[PDB]
Amino acid sequence: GSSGSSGDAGGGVGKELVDLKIIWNKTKHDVKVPLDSTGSELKQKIHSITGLPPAMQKVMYKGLVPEDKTLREIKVTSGAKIMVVGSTISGPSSG
């Protein structure tokens, strides 16, 4: 009998999403996000994982993170630590 197959070949591909560590309390979630992500997106980028509100979030990586500038602008690289605050999840009322 015996059976099996596999393939992997293409070309190009510059730089894919950047690997970031979602630091919160004591967790490490490896998420791949584009550097084109605005410093503001991070919030929604973290909330999308942390599940917590951004208003109660603390986006700070070895320095304040501007929302007017993207990661690639705020100076981010593959392996950029991201600290977050919070404890008890919380959702909105209206939305």
Structure tokens of 28? 């490490």
For 81-95, b/e burial (b = at least 16 CB within 10 A) is ebbbebeeeeeeeee
| Length of the chain in terms of residues written | 95
Please report, for the chain, the start and end positions of each structural domain, with discontinuous segments joined by +: 1-95
Q: Three-state SS across 25-91?
A: CCEEEEEEECCCCEHHHHHHHHHHHHCCCCCCCCCECCCECCCCCEHHHHCCCCCEEEEECCCCCCC
What method was applied to determine this entry? NMR
Residues 41, 31, 10, 72: is their CA dihedral positive or negative?
positive
Angle at 25 between CA 28 and CA 68, to 5 degrees: 75
Phi/psi of residue 81, nearest 5 degrees: -70, 145
Structure tokens of 39? 């410093």
Are the CB atoms for 68 and 10 separated by under 8 Å? no
Q: CA–CA separation, 8 vs 10, rounded Å? A: 7
Q: CA–CA separation, 48 vs 51, rounded Å? A: 6
Pick the CATH number of 1-95 from 3.40.109.10, 3.10.20.90, 3.40.50.10740, 3.50.50.100: 3.10.20.90
Q: CA–CA separation, 81 vs 95, rounded Å? A: 30
